[PDB]
């Protein structure tokens, strides 16, 4: 489609809306021009969702509890408030870890204060203090507690900070109050920021006066990899084969100690910019630790990232870098040789959260595929600035896309594959469009790194080329 055709598509779709919604949505839909560097000339983002339009977004609790805190394996995270939020988010996100669940690790469990009417009317702080004692009795090997606030907590004027200070002192335990109530912000995004600030304020400084950790010149942290299906492990392996020492993973398979040790590293390696840029900036400000963005999706990006990381160290790491690249060359070349001819020329539309809608484009291109539309639930304009150079001219961009818009865009564009989430999957399959989940990896992965690219390629092919797709039309019409 031409720029003019895509502009026309946008206007046609926007016709359904009442005027206020129409005027708003027009600002969140754009035709890419990779020549633009300031996305604030092209698209608005990180604003409220319009009521009644079926946004795909979540809330700040999802961004804090679901995304940042929940993966930390040896802490207990309390979903503080009524029963729903913790139950719907129990083990929905595949933030993988090694541990003994219910004993030393707690990630897939749902701990909650299960607010009842009396808790709303009189406050939950007394219940929270009692709950903490019960956690300590029944889960003695927990290494810290977080309190993930749900909507009612701030609305009723509870003081979880006081409870966390008093109980944390009483028990000589890190207890972290997190004001991630879902009424705050507009999406998962503010939850990330809130969560980062809570790590800063209650965990990260614990070892500021401790000189016992033996650092090396090659110490790094992986910042913003939540280890979906093992993604952080298939990243870590490469960094360490390159000669680095990965002191911490934030927060996939993460432990409280490795978070506390992170101020000792030489370089912070940021994968998810959106979720963790906050604490990365803090660590630069406070500890002098530099940070850099990288991308481990597909061989082209992974090779570029390894080289750019290695360049921050000495010749010995740059030599190991080239050894790693040489080792994996035949492996990813074999993946491309098998799958690229099966996928060449195929067109994909994506819709994901705050990173992947741009970050995975290179991996598609390594299989000869074309990303013809992309967009984000909750990205900010700094994300869009990074996107416009990664997407082709005249491709479609959508911020906080409505259900209606996504369906109508897909009907016109007729992509060969869609990559989005669980609420989207079954819609598009019924339309006869191959769909891959690009949050959960459709229960597959990892997709990061060289080993992840093999699985990514296998997966795109198994679904795009599946025999089921030729069968939706009954042969009698």
């Amino acid at each position: 489609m031409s720029r003019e055709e895509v502009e026309s598509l946008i206007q046609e779709v926007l016709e359904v809306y009442p005027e206020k919604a129409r005027k708003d949505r027009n600002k969140h839909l754009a035709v890419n021009d990779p020549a633009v560097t300031q996305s604030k000339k092209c698209i608005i983002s990180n604003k409220k969702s319009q009521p009644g339009l079926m946004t795909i977004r979540g809330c700040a609790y999802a961004g804090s509890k679901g995304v940042v805190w929940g993966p930390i394996k040896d802490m207990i995270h309390i979903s503080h408030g009524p029963v729903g939020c913790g139950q719907y988010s129990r083990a929905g996100r595949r933030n993988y870890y090694i541990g003994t669940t219910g004993v030393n690790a707690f990630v897939t469990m749902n701990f909650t204060s299960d607010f009842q009417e009396k808790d709303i009317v009189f406050g939950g702080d007394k219940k929270l203090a009692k709950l903490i004692d019960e956690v300590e009795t029944l889960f003695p090997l927990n290494k810290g507690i977080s309190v993930q606030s749900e909507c009612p907590i701030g609305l009723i004027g509870d003081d979880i900070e006081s409870v966390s200070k008093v109980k944390g002192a009483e028990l000589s335990k890190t207890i972290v109050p997190v004001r991630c109530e879902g009424f705050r912000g507009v999406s998962q995004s503010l939850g990330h920021h809130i969560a980062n600030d809570a790590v800063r304020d209650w965990v990260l400084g614990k070892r500021d006066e401790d000189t016992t950790f033996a650092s090396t010149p090659y110490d790094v942290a992986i910042i913003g990899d939540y280890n979906i299906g093992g993604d952080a492990w298939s990243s870590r392996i490469l960094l360490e084969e390159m000669g680095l020492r990965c002191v911490a993973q934030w927060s996939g398979d993460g432990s409280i100690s490795e978070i506390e040790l992170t101020p000792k590293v030489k370089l912070n390696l940021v994968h998810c910019y959106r979720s963790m840029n906050y604490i990365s900036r803090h660590m630069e400000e406070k500890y002098g630790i530099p940070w850099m963005e990288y991308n481990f999706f597909g061989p082209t990006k992974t090779i570029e990232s390894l080289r750019a990381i290695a360049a921050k160290f000495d010749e010995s790491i740059q030599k190991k870098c080239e050894e790693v690249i040489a080792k994996y060359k035949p492996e990813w070349e074999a993946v491309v040789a098998k799958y690229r001819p099966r996928l060449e020329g195929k067109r994909v539309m994506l819709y994901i959260g705050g990173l992947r809608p741009r970050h995975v484009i290179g991996a598609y291109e390594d299989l000869g595929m074309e990303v013809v539309g992309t967009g984000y639930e909750f990205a900010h304009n700094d994300d869009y600035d990074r996107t416009m150079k990664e997407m082709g001219d005249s491709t479609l961009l959508y911020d906080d896309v409505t259900g209606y818009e996504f369906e109508e865009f897909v009907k016109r564009i007729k992509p060969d594959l869609i990559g989005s989430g669980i609420k989207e999957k079954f819609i598009f399959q019924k339309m006869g469009i191959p769909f891959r989940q690009m949050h959960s990896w459709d229960y597959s992965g990892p997709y990061h790194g060289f080993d992840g690219f093999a699985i990514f390629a296998r997966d795109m092919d198994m679904t795009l080329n599946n025999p089921c797709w030729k069968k939706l039309q009954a042969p009698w019409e």
Binding site: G52, V83, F426, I427
Partner: protein
């Protein structure tokens, strides 16, 4: 590394030696992990009666609940009406979760909107969100009805749904006669099933309260059927099938079976099937109203009795042999239709299956959980099968319900070793299956973690999970199954006896050790 011909996903990739070594180095270098001997010691302690006693003294902490919140149930109820959009007044994060939770169980689209109240609404309330949200929803998604419930923010702030909807109509945001039934659905009261009751009663009120003067009980010669919170397609289907076979005129009020099972034929259908507005308007003219899940339809019952003047029968959920018999006999009485030969034969086929499978079922011990009516029906059928339902857990159950179940247990010798637990969760249940080990669990996917825990103690302590309930996320298409009626009983019996026999085969598969009992014929 990968071999292109045999690519490994996370399992078993991370068992490769290089990944294993890397993970050991991570642990040793940076995780400051408790020693394995201490982990084992603590695990062992969590399997003990001493731990169970501390566990059951909890007052403030809930761990691994077996319930969800009200608006989830309101959304399901709403989905069962023709061209109806579920709309939850309040916070949008809730709607992302409700949709996803049902998407994962049904493997289907689940349509629901929010009006995206934010912190700013704490000052003034959510009235403008309701006005724009209703207008936007109607224009964009073209429902014929919008069924409104609430999230907990809206309840805490105290938004008056009735007034806000009235003002939306007064100011022209939606037409005066466009149906906007509503219910307050606070997540901190009851559970998801309560939300269903509240939503249904709101819809019932909307269509009938003001129009009662022309209504005559029995004048439409039908029976209304209210299914409650129901997540097996086969359950809506079997009820309609049985009533149709009997020649009984009926109206199923809230019927999502079409919208939760659309064909993959190249188009997405946002809406399909459902109870019509005409059916809801005409419902007071029925002979009577039957509640399939009465233990979460208490508000609905008061409205149907108080306003429609229907003499709602005292019937249990139609699960198992006796209660399906009772349901059919009562429907026969009300409708004047005899129970037909087809259903009599189906009953006899179930009894045949019972006689064929009784020797393997006899004395088998089960832990089980779920919503109150499902649980009590499962208990009843297990007693009919000569099984012992020893740990009966209903997190969202109440004292009156527990008394009813204790009375059912009393009417059978197979109830002698059974206890009913209300307000307890799956962490409580975990202790019970260690300290008083049953043969099997019957429950939802969250039970898999209990099975996992039991195997870790040892194979001889493992309690296998049999998946019946909601949500079931780790198997495919079990939502097509049936648990009601003779068909449901046949399905449950078959699943139970074969789970028994599968486990026995596993235990007797060991060459020259236990395979003396690895019989071809069982």
């Amino acid at each position: 590394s990968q071999q292109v011909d045999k690519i490994k996903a996370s399992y078993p990739l991370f068992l490769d030696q290089d990944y294993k070594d890397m993970l050991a180095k991570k642990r040793d270098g940076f995780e400051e992990k408790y020693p394995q001997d201490k982990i084992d010691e603590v695990f062992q302690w969590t399997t003990t009666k001493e731990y169970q006693e501390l566990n059951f003294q909890r007052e403030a902490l809930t761990v691994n609940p077996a319930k969800a919140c009200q608006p989830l149930g309101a959304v399901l109820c709403a989905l069962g009406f023709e061209k109806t959009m579920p709309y939850v007044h309040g916070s949008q994060g809730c709607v992302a979760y409700f949709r996803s939770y049902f998407n994962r169980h049904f493997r289907e689209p689940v349509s629901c909107v929010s009006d995206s109240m934010t912190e700013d609404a704490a000052v003034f309330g959510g009235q403008q969100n309701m006005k724009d949200g209703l207008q936007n929803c109607k224009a964009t998604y073209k429902p014929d009805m919008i069924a409104v419930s609430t999230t907990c923010m809206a309840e805490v702030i105290g938004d008056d749904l009735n007034a806000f909807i009235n003002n939306s109509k007064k100011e022209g945001f939606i037409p005066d006669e466009f149906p906007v039934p509503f219910a307050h659905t606070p997540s901190f009261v009851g559970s998801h099933v309560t939300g269903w009751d509240n939503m249904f009663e709101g819809i019932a009120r909307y269509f009938t309260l003001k129009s009662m003067d022309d209504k005559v009980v029995g004048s439409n010669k039908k029976i209304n059927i209210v299914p409650g919170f129901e997540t097996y397609l086969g359950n809506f289907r079997v009820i309609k099938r049985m009533l149709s076979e009997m020649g009984v005129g009926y109206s199923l009020l809230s019927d999502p079976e079409e919208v939760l099972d659309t064909p993959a034929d190249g188009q997405f259908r946002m809406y399909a099937g459902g109870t019509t507005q005409e059916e809801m308007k005409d419902a007071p003219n029925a002979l009577n109203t039957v509640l399939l899940q009465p233990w979460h339809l208490e508000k609905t019952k008061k409205f149907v009795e108080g306003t429609w003047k229907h003499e709602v029968p005292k019937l249990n959920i139609p699960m198992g042999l006796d209660w399906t018999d009772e349901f059919l006999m009562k429907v026969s009485e009300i409708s004047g239709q005899p129970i037909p030969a087809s259903l009599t034969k189906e009953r006899g086929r179930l009894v045949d299956m019972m006689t064929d499978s009784h020797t393997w079922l006899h004395g088998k011990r089960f832990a089980l959980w779920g919503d109150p009516d499902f649980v009590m029906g499962l208990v009843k059928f297990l007693l009919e099968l000569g099984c012992e339902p020893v740990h009966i857990l209903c997190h969202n159950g109440n004292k009156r319900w527990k008394k009813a179940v204790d009375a059912i247990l009393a009417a059978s010798p197979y109830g002698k070793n059974a206890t009913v637990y209300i307000g307890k969760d799956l962490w409580h249940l975990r202790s019970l299956v260690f300290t008083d080990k049953p043969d099997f669990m019957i429950g939802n996917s969250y039970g898999k973690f209990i099975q996992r825990d039991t195997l870790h103690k040892g194979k001889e302590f493992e309690v296998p999970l049999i998946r019946i309930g909601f949500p079931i996320f780790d198997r495919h298409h079990l939502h097509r199954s049936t648990t009601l009626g003779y068909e449901g009983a046949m399905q449950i019996l078959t699943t139970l006896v074969n789970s028994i026999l599968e486990r026995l085969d596993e235990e007797t598969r060991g060459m020259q050790a236990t395979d003396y009992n690895h019989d071809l014929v069982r």
